[PDB]
Amino acid sequence: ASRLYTLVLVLQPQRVLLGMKKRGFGAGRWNGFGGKVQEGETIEDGARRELQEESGLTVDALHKVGQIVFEFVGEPELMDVHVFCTDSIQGTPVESDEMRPCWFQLDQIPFKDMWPDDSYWFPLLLQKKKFHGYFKFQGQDTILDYTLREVDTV
Numbered sequence: 070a071s072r073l074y075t076l077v078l079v080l081q082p083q084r085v086l087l088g089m090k091k092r093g094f095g096a097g098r099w100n101g102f103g104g105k106v107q108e109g110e111t112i113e114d115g116a117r118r119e120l121q122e123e124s125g126l127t128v129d130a131l132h133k134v135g136q137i138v139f140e141f142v143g144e145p146e147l148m149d150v151h152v153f154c155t156d157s158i159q160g161t162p163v164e165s166d167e168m169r170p171c172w173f174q175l176d177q178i179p180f181k182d183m184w185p186d187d188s189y190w191f192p193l194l195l196q197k198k199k200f201h202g203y204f205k206f207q208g209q210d211t212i213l214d215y216t217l218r219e220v221d222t223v
């Protein structure tokens with residue numbers, strides 16, 4: 070068993086929107102926006118909800134671009150992260166309790182202050198290739214195992 074999560078990247082031709090996570094899981098790493106999917110909503114609806122809660126933004130269309138499954142050693146549930154992109158945002162991003170948003174140039178992505186797995190799959194997002202990844206972590210810094218491939222259907 071696994072628990073559904075979302076992750077949303079606003080990727081525009083020369084920049085990508087990240088938020089500095091201010092509290093909770095992943096605090097202190099830049100990331101896309103997202104969270105747990107709730108009972109009674111779709112995954113994509115949960116992705117939009119979280120985008121709105123964390124940034125104020127709404128979007129016309131979200132595209133599925135990837136899936137990443139995480140194992141954390143000693144934790145029973147795998148995390149099944151559904152990754153979306155958009156270039157179609159509505160509004161200007163604002164800081165929330167969870168996130169402080171900033172735009173980054175595509176060659177200035179702050180990998181050293183991101184989850185360590187992002188170094189591996191982010192390039193494929195940027196290159197517009199759909200992927201499936203799997204990372205096993207010991208704590209929040211150490212990747213013990215991983216797999217990564219491109220896919221045609223996410």
Ligand SMILES: Nc1nc2c([nH]c(=O)n2[C@H]2C[C@H](O)[C@@H](COP(=O)(O)O)O2)c(=O)[nH]1
Pocket residue numbers: 074075076077093094095100101102103104105139148150184185186187
């Ligand atoms: N880029 C990236 N996002 C992750 C990783 N692990 C992980 O749960 N997430 C995402 C999914 C969700 O958007 C978010 C976790 O949910 P909360 O912020 O609600 O705790 O972090 C990771 O290793 N890298």
